[PDB]
Amino acid sequence: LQWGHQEVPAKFNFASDVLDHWADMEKAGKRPPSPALWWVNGKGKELMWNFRELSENSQQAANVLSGACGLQRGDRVAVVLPRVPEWWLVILGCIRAGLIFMPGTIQMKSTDILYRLQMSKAKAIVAGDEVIQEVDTVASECPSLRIKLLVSEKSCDGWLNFKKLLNEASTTHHCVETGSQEASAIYFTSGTSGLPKMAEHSYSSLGLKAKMDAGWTGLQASDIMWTISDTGWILNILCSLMEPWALGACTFVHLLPKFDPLVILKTLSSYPIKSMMGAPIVYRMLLQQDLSSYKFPHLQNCVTVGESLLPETLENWRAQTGLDIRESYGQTETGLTCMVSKTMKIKPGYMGTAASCYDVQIIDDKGNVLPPGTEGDIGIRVKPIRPIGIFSGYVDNPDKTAANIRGDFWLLGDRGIKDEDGYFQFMGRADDIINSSGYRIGPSEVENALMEHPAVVETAVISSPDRGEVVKAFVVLASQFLSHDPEQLTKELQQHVKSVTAPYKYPRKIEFVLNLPKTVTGKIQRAKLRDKEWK
């Protein structure tokens, strides 16, 4: 890879360097025993660890992984757990013992579990009892897999008993003196644009970056943050674990087994949660609940990431709660990239300014920095100095990593515009923009236009070969419209878009379909549709 060099300490480890500072303050009486992790299941069980208990209990976890499981420094460990405290303990265990943690969603099918296990050559899997049947259907096809570690109230033959081993383990573990650029995590990307990519992160690219970013949410040392996230995604490590614990703040975890928005509302209203992080969908769902009946005067900080925060959602939330939602932007490869900080003015439709380690710019085809107000590719300067926070590269695929470097910049693959104050506005995934008859057409606008029509339940807008190409809509019809003549309905839909947007943006092709392809997270796979359209 030719992408600069870093200015980092030789060694870094979040457990030893950040977390164990807080444990030591408590132990030296320099700080009172302060809550670190507060977990509830929504059924009347709660558990809380202070910083000393977290440190002792996660040292036990490192002992289990390194001792009982025989795992050696650099060994790769898949972690497929729901929102249970053992996820936080196991990840910390991995960090202490110098093991590469590889989190995945419990929402995975057995074919996804096979793909990840095989692709990553995982030596271990840590799972809960609701995924062990799926794991065991495919585990024999995974020749690198040596250890199956189960987190459960029950035992299963073939699986080591985490909870029992944890309790037998010493609360003293000698934390590995891990290198700042040594591999700490592998995150599989969610698969929006294609097969999941294996994104390697270092001890510093996660923990030092998080340390440097600490407090961007508005969180402070005496506060409680609720990050609402699947444990399988990078959001969970960066905001659920690292942000609060860099600050000595408490992280709040609700099992939330059904992701029920009324449960989220009740939780916010019943617990002294000062800050929350969730995808835009969380706020949208909350706005459809009865916010007159469930007040949360304690809540101060509302942040979001993952997709565009609609000005409409921002404005309704403000009206209904008196709070701002502060948007952030990034990707698995880069972590927190742009954000609206606690002190910054909120500009609806904009996702903030560069995160501190980063020179984020809009760049042209040659890698040159563009003036404000010009649409281009969003990029992070990586030469001559690669900033702390950027990942280590795609596992096994250095060609792929190199292919995203343009001149001095890492390409995010997203289009944007930067305003006069340096705020970014997201302008779509670069590969999804349609070029027809010398026009550039973004799919979101066409999709939104289509969705206004009562006939349309869901839609994806993609390029199709023609005039170079043409705008095509895939449309899932409302049941009552399936009986309509499709030629006539196509014309009616084409005419409708032509009336809400620039007429050069209308879908010249419309295909009616019964479902759209989506990732495990529900993101429409436009690439997949596009690939098939071009054949």
Ligand X SMILES: Nc1ncnc2c1ncn2[C@@H]1O[C@H](COP(=O)(O)CP(=O)(O)OP(=O)(O)O)[C@@H](O)[C@H]1O
Question: Is 194 annotated for ligand binding?
Answer: yes
414 is in the binding site of which of Mg ion, ligand X, Cl ion, none (Cβ under 5 to 8 A by kind)? ligand X
Question: Is 507 annotated for ligand binding?
Answer: yes
Within 10 Å of residue 83's Cβ, how many Cβ atoms? 21
The Cα 98–Cα 94 span in angstroms is 6
Q: Which stretch binds Cl ion (CB under 5 A): 276-284, 383-391, 434-442, 523-531?
A: 276-284
Q: According to CB under 5 A, which residues from 424 to 443 bind Cl ion?
A: none
Cβ within 8 Å of residue 435, ≥6 positions away: 441, 463, 468, 469
Q: Which amino acid is at 221?
A: A
The Cα 11–Cα 218 span in angstroms is 28
456 is in the binding site of which of Cl ion, Mg ion, ligand X, none (Cβ under 5 to 8 A by kind)? Mg ion
If the CB atoms of residues 233 and 245 are measured against Cl ion, the closer one turns out to be: 245
- What minimum distance in Å lies between the beta carbon of 477 and Mg ion? 10
- What minimum distance in Å lies between the beta carbon of 20 and Cl ion? 6
Residue nearest to Mg ion (CB): 456
Residue 367 vs residues 363, 372, 410, 411, 413: alpha-carbon distances, Å: 5, 15, 10, 9, 13
Q: What Rg, from alpha-carbon coordinates, does the chain have? A: 24
Q: Which stretch binds Cl ion (CB under 5 A): 56-64, 65-73, 95-103, 273-281?
A: 273-281
- What minimum distance in Å lies between the beta carbon of 289 and ligand X? 23
Question: Is 202 annotated for ligand binding?
Answer: no
Q: Does 79 bind Cl ion (CB under 5 A)?
A: no
Question: What would the 3-class secondary structure string for 334-356 be?
Answer: CEEEEECCCCCCCCCCCCCEECC
Residue matched to tokens 């929350």: 276
Work out which of 116, 148, 326, 429 binds ligand X, going by CB under 6 A: 429
Q: Does 200 bind ligand X (CB under 6 A)?
A: no
What SS3 class is residue 420?
Answer: coil
Q: Does 260 bind Cl ion (CB under 5 A)?
A: yes
Q: According to CB under 5 A, which residues from 298 to 327 bind Cl ion?
A: 310, 313
Work out which of 34, 110, 118, 192 binds ligand X, going by CB under 6 A: 192
The Cα 336–Cα 138 span in angstroms is 35
The Cα 49–Cα 39 span in angstroms is 9
Within 10 Å of residue 63's Cβ, how many Cβ atoms? 23
Q: According to CB under 6 A, which residues from 384 to 423 bind ligand X?
A: 412-414
If the CB atoms of residues 55 and 301 are measured against ligand X, the closer one turns out to be: 301
- DSSP letters, 113-141, are HHHHHHHHT-SEEEEETTTHHHHHHHGGG
> CA 368, 373, 374, 377: dihedral to nearest 10 degrees?
70
Q: Which stretch binds ligand X (CB under 6 A): 110-118, 152-160, 186-194, 468-476?
A: 186-194
Q: Does 196 bind ligand X (CB under 6 A)?
A: yes
Question: Is 197 annotated for ligand binding?
Answer: yes
Q: Does 256 bind Cl ion (CB under 5 A)?
A: yes
Q: Does 190 bind ligand X (CB under 6 A)?
A: yes
280 is in the binding site of which of Mg ion, ligand X, Cl ion, none (Cβ under 5 to 8 A by kind)? Cl ion
The Cα 371–Cα 378 span in angstroms is 13
Alpha helices in 110-259 (DSSP H): 110-120, 132-138, 162-168, 203, 209-213, 234-235, 243-247
- What minimum distance in Å lies between the beta carbon of 328 and ligand X? 6
Q: Which amino acid is at 18?
A: V
Q: Which residues bind Mg ion (CB under 5 A)?
A: 451, 456
- Residues contributing to the site for Cl ion (CB under 5 A): 21, 256, 258, 260, 263, 280, 310, 313
The annotation places the binding site for substrate at 332, 440
The annotation places the binding site for ATP at 189-197, 327-332, 414, 429, 523
- Residues contributing to the site for ligand X (CB under 6 A): 189-193, 196-197, 305-308, 327, 329, 331-332, 351, 412-414, 426, 429, 523
The annotation places the binding site for CoA at 107, 437-439, 467, 498, 506-508
